[PDB]
Amino acid sequence: KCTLKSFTVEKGIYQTSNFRVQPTESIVRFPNITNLCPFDEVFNATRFAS
Amino acid sequence: GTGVLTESNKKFLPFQQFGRDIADTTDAVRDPQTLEILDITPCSFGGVSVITPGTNTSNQVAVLYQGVNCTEVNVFQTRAGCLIGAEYVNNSYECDIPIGAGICASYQSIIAYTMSLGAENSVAYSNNSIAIPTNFTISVTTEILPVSMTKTSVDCTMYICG
Amino acid sequence: SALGKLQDVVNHNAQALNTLVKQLSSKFGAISSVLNDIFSRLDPPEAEVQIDRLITGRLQSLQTYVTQQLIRAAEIRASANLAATKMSECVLGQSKRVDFCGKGYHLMSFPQSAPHGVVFLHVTYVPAQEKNFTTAPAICHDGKAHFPREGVFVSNGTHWFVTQRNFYEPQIITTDNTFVSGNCDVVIGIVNNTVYDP
Amino acid sequence: TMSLGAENSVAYSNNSIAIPTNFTISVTTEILPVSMTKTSVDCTMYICGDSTECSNLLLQYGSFCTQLKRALTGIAVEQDKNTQEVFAQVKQIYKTPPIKYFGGFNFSQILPDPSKPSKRSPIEDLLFNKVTQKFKGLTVLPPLLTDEMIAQYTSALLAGTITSGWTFGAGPALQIPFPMQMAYRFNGIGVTQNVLYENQKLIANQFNSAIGKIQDSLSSTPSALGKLQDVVNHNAQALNTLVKQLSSKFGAISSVLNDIFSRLDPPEAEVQIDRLITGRLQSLQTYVTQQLIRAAEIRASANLAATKMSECVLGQSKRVDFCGKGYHLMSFPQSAPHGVVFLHVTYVPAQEKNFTTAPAICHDGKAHFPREGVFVSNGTHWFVTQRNFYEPQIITTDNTFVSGNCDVVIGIVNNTVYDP
Ligand SMILES: *[C@@H]1O[C@H](CO)[C@@H](O[C@@H]2O[C@H](CO)[C@@H](O)[C@H](O)[C@H]2NC(C)=O)[C@H](O)[C@H]1NC(C)=O
Ligand SMILES: *[C@@H]1O[C@H](CO)[C@@H](O[C@@H]2O[C@H](CO)[C@@H](O)[C@H](O)[C@H]2NC(C)=O)[C@H](O)[C@H]1NC(C)=O
Ligand SMILES: *[C@@H]1O[C@H](CO)[C@@H](O[C@@H]2O[C@H](CO)[C@@H](O)[C@H](O)[C@H]2NC(C)=O)[C@H](O)[C@H]1NC(C)=O
Ligand SMILES: *[C@@H]1O[C@H](CO)[C@@H](O[C@@H]2O[C@H](CO)[C@@H](O)[C@H](O)[C@H]2NC(C)=O)[C@H](O)[C@H]1NC(C)=O
Ligand SMILES: *[C@@H]1O[C@H](CO)[C@@H](O[C@@H]2O[C@H](CO)[C@@H](O)[C@H](O)[C@H]2NC(C)=O)[C@H](O)[C@H]1NC(C)=O
Ligand SMILES: *[C@@H]1O[C@H](CO)[C@@H](O[C@@H]2O[C@H](CO)[C@@H](O)[C@H](O)[C@H]2NC(C)=O)[C@H](O)[C@H]1NC(C)=O
Ligand SMILES: *[C@@H]1O[C@H](CO)[C@@H](O[C@@H]2O[C@H](CO)[C@@H](O)[C@H](O)[C@H]2NC(C)=O)[C@H](O)[C@H]1NC(C)=O
Ligand SMILES: *[C@@H]1O[C@H](CO)[C@@H](O[C@@H]2O[C@H](CO)[C@@H](O)[C@H](O)[C@H]2NC(C)=O)[C@H](O)[C@H]1NC(C)=O
Ligand SMILES: *[C@@H]1O[C@H](CO)[C@@H](O[C@@H]2O[C@H](CO)[C@@H](O)[C@H](O)[C@H]2NC(C)=O)[C@H](O)[C@H]1NC(C)=O
Ligand SMILES: *[C@@H]1O[C@H](CO)[C@@H](O)[C@H](O)[C@H]1NC(C)=O
Ligand SMILES: *[C@@H]1O[C@H](CO)[C@@H](O)[C@H](O)[C@H]1NC(C)=O
């Protein structure tokens, strides 16, 4: 009735809207990052510069 | 992207990252962590159509989902799609409300049947038999044809600006 | 539901005009859909762009309506040409074309006017009450084969007659309603009977 | 420079005529499209897709894709109506007798084959074998009448036109032996029945040979079905063009909705999205208009096909070249993908012969005119014979009629007129 904008619908077949399955999960895929920066040497150094 | 991740029989080359179809859209992907090939299919989608016998007669309706298997949602499966709210009948009648692929539904509740082509009629043919009419019947038939549609003219300046 | 076509024409035109009219109340992405509001709320520098967007949208919609009207007019003109042909042939004469002027053999037709259309009354002739018969292609008589001029040879079981195709009017087979052509050796299925001579 | 055709000059003279002494049964084909694929488009999926804010931006633009859905539904129902009009012309399903003997004529090629699981004649099976996804809201609706029902209508029409002549198209079906139906059809085109009944074997042999040659020619030439192949080609290429238009820049900085949303703030993202959606709407409008024009053309073709089915098949048409080159006899329809193929059986004269003709015969001061034929002369004697065939007959007073004296017409000749 809303699609036809009328209160009485004549006999027949009508198209109203679309059926869609809503996704419900998220899958992020990125590599096994293994490029650790040499911050251990910079911070854990026993003697620092003047 | 959004879709249904499934195992892919496609074999990407070692440098290949994405897969593309003729429509230039992503369909096969390679997982960065574990090097495997996966397919992407859009989530099951289709239009919705409502079969109604007319509000004057009644209010019951049967809904047809176009191009979806019935397992992905008084349930019937047709070539057009999944039909719910109507019962399938082994009988046959004339096509009342078209559906598709030779299926038509009507209200008697709502029933869906295969449309009937016509009344079977075998004619006895033999090489020495003829049939001659012995009477007649004057018939009068009608035929409606549109001729002219309503003449309209527009005023561009007032419609656009006023 | 007999007059579906004319009602469809009227409804199509009415709904096209209604849609074109209702297209005015569309914002087309502009912040408003009223000329005076945009004129009073903003200065020319961006009111010009807003008016440009609105007028472009309205012109596009009207042009779409015009194209739809053109296509429908072409279809209606084809239908009108068909109607003129039907008038000139079925009404002003008799048609030998099958089903062109009604189911069955055509006799004559009468026209009737209608809103935005014309209605015909095809008066047609329909045979009924058929009856089977045993028939032969030709009659062999004294070594001569007699063929019907216009009828077809039929026989109720004992006697043979010649009758017109579309009606059962049995007649005695004489030498004036049959024409001789050759002997009765080459015709396949020829039978034996006498041919009365007046 | 192209040559229009071979030079020819008929030896027209004042009092000479040419009359055929032989004939040639010819079979020709005619291919006509009926309907194309019924497609329906989705507004939100095509325009941008799964972005809710995009749909919010769209819904305030207007009800354009409402009109598009309306137009496409109209086209689909028009296609279904076209098929119904072309094929659904008989309300009964006639069935051929089990024993298929029709006085020597061989209809094995066009009659249904029970051996095939599809229940189709070899001709239509060849047609099906001779004519050759991923969607983004672009749906293809199935036709209402499947191929099997169309084959059923074709079989019913064939059975009606073989068993009961043309009578079933104008009332009840009245059986009649096939040779008499063919004699009736010759009598329709001005050739008497004795010509058929004295040549039944030869006519049957010519008919069988012609239909075999037609099957072979369809099997050989691949370009015969262009009028049906191009419909599918046009639809597919238009659909592919519409799909390609989805990834067009349209002057925006990027062609991807999500990237525009992510990398840009609403201020100019709104302008970019407006440009993109306007461009896509324009492309969709163009596609819909193209579909409408193609639908009009296909509907005209389907109306022509319906007229041919009604006239050449259900009866005999005296219109020239309307149902094949030559004098029309009868035509057989055959189903085809998105169309119909006719097999026009036509009568073609051959082996003409010179003769000397006269308008009338003067005798006892009376001018005798031919009643149904034409006066000829092999050089010494004068005969009267039918126009389309050389069947000389002694001139008498029953096949001629008298009118006036023999000093008013021009070219009259002197001869006697035997009285039986
Ligand atoms: C041919 O058909 C007509 C009607 O289709 C027959 O006329 C009817 O005859 C019966 C019996 O006498 C009457 O009761 C009806 O009133 C007649 N109908 C009309 C409209 O007058 C006619 O008898 C038939 N003729 C033959 C030879 O069968
Ligand atoms: C003329 O006779 C033929 C056969 O003698 C009839 O054909 C049969 O008609 C009966 C009537 O119901 C059917 O049950 C049979 O099936 C027919 N035969 C076949 C092989 O189908 C024919 O109907 C008769 N004509 C009329 C007008 O009754
Ligand atoms: C076939 O028709 C002929 C012509 O009417 C019939 O012959 C007549 O039949 C009537 C009634 O039986 C007799 O009173 C006449 O004397 C017959 N005339 C002649 C010249 O014989 C014949 O009977 C019909 N056949 C059948 C089987 O009914
Ligand atoms: C029609 O008549 C002719 C001649 O009256 C029949 O021909 C005869 O047929 C018999 C049987 O074969 C022969 O023994 C005679 O020698 C034939 N005579 C002539 C002059 O041809 C013919 O058979 C008849 N038709 C039918 C169907 O019996
Ligand atoms: C028989 O008809 C043929 C054509 O159908 C005639 O051939 C032509 O006749 C004319 C006039 O005599 C010549 O000018 C042409 O050169 C002829 N054609 C050719 C290819 O040579 C023929 O003359 C006719 N004969 C008779 C006796 O009437
Ligand atoms: C009429 O034309 C037909 C076909 O063109 C002729 O039939 C052919 O006759 C020749 C000679 O006897 C045979 O070799 C062929 O095999 C026949 N063809 C067929 C299909 O049977 C026929 O002879 C011609 N008649 C006249 C009087 O010219
Ligand atoms: C009608 O046509 C069919 C098909 O051409 C004929 O069937 C052929 O018969 C011959 C000899 O029996 C075979 O060598 C062919 O292989 C058959 N054709 C096919 C396609 O298998 C048939 O003989 C013709 N005549 C009749 C009366 O049916
Ligand atoms: C024209 O045709 C007539 C009739 O066929 C011919 O006259 C007869 O011809 C046959 C065959 O030659 C002869 O056996 C007859 O004796 C002829 N009858 C007479 C009364 O002469 C005539 O010869 C034909 N003319 C030409 C030039 O062929
Ligand atoms: C046909 O015959 C008639 C009569 O036999 C011919 O008419 C005669 O023609 C001669 C020649 O000019 C005249 O002297 C006579 O007076 C005519 N008599 C009559 C009664 O008309 C006529 O010429 C012949 N025509 C042809 C073409 O042979
Ligand atoms: C007529 O048909 C029958 C079978 O229907 C057949 O046996 C017979 O030979 C045929 N005769 C003729 C003359 O066609
Ligand atoms: C017949 O036509 C020829 C030309 O082909 C002409 O020479 C002759 O005079 C004509 N005869 C008559 C009687 O007109």
Side-chain angles (χ1 to χ4, degrees), chain D residues 395-411:
Chain D
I395 180 170
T396 70
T397 71
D398 289 345
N399 60 7
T400 61
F401 68 95
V402 183
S403 288
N405 51 359
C406 70
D407 59 356
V408 289
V409 302
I410 296 157

Side-chain angles (χ1 to χ4, degrees), chain B residues 128-150 152 159-161, chain C residues 5 13 20 58 65 69 76 79 86 116-118 120-122 124-126 128-129 131-133 135 165 168:
Chain B
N128 72 328
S129 174
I130 200 175
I132 292 284
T134 67
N135 206 337
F136 51 71
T137 298
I138 300 298
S139 165
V140 172
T141 64
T142 60
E143 188 170 2
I144 297 99
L145 285 177
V147 161
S148 61
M149 65 180 288
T150 305
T152 78
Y159 173 75
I160 295 295
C161 294
Chain C
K5 322 179 72 46
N13 196 358
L20 192 65
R58 284 172 177 192
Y65 160 76
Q69 270 287 313
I76 279 297
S79 183
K86 288 231 175 186
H116 308 316
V118 64
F120 287 105
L121 306 190
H122 296 318
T124 179
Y125 171 93
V126 164
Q129 292 188 249
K131 171 163 178 45
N132 48 27
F133 288 106
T135 177
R165 298 100 186 274
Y168 186 48

Side-chain angles (χ1 to χ4, degrees), chain C residues 18 22 44 56 66 75 77 131 147 154 173-174 178:
Chain C
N18 196 1
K22 279 185 169 67
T56 297
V66 163
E75 188 276 340
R77 184 252 317 286
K131 171 163 178 45
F147 294 87
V154 294
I173 316 167
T174 67
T178 67

